[PDB]
Amino acid sequence: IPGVATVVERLLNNGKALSNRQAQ
Amino acid sequence: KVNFGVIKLKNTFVSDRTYNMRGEDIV
Amino acid sequence: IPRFSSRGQIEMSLTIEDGTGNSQNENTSVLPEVGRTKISTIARVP
Incomplete structure (x- = not known):
């Protein structure tokens, strides 16, 4: 079971853009 | 964006x- | 491995083994001696 730190850091990876939003 | x-x-x-089938492992 | 599901149902992945070990004057007649049984499955319950 991975940790929140590992999961989130791997999420914020290899993306070239801006202007983000959040989806439930 | x-x-x-x-x-x-x-x-x-x-x-x-993963499940074992006594020879035929299934993923 | 338990978890929840729609309408508060409980889903579970189960591996179960249980039972006795063979040990032969009415001794076996008194003791449980229920054999051995293993079941591996997954099910959900309201």
Whole structure:
């Protein structure tokens, strides 16, 4: 079971853009 | 432009699972 | 491995083994001696 730190850091990876939003 | 989202699965597990069939392993 | 599901149902992945070990004057007649049973499955319950 991975940790929140590992999961989130791997999420914020290899993306070239801006202007983000959040989806439930 | 970009979206970060959380999706809550209900009826299934998320991690891949493995089952033994006495010779024919199933993933 | 338990978890929840729609309408508050509980889904579970189960591996169960249970039972006795064979050990032969009415001794076996008194003791449980229920054999051995293993079941591996997955099910959900309201």
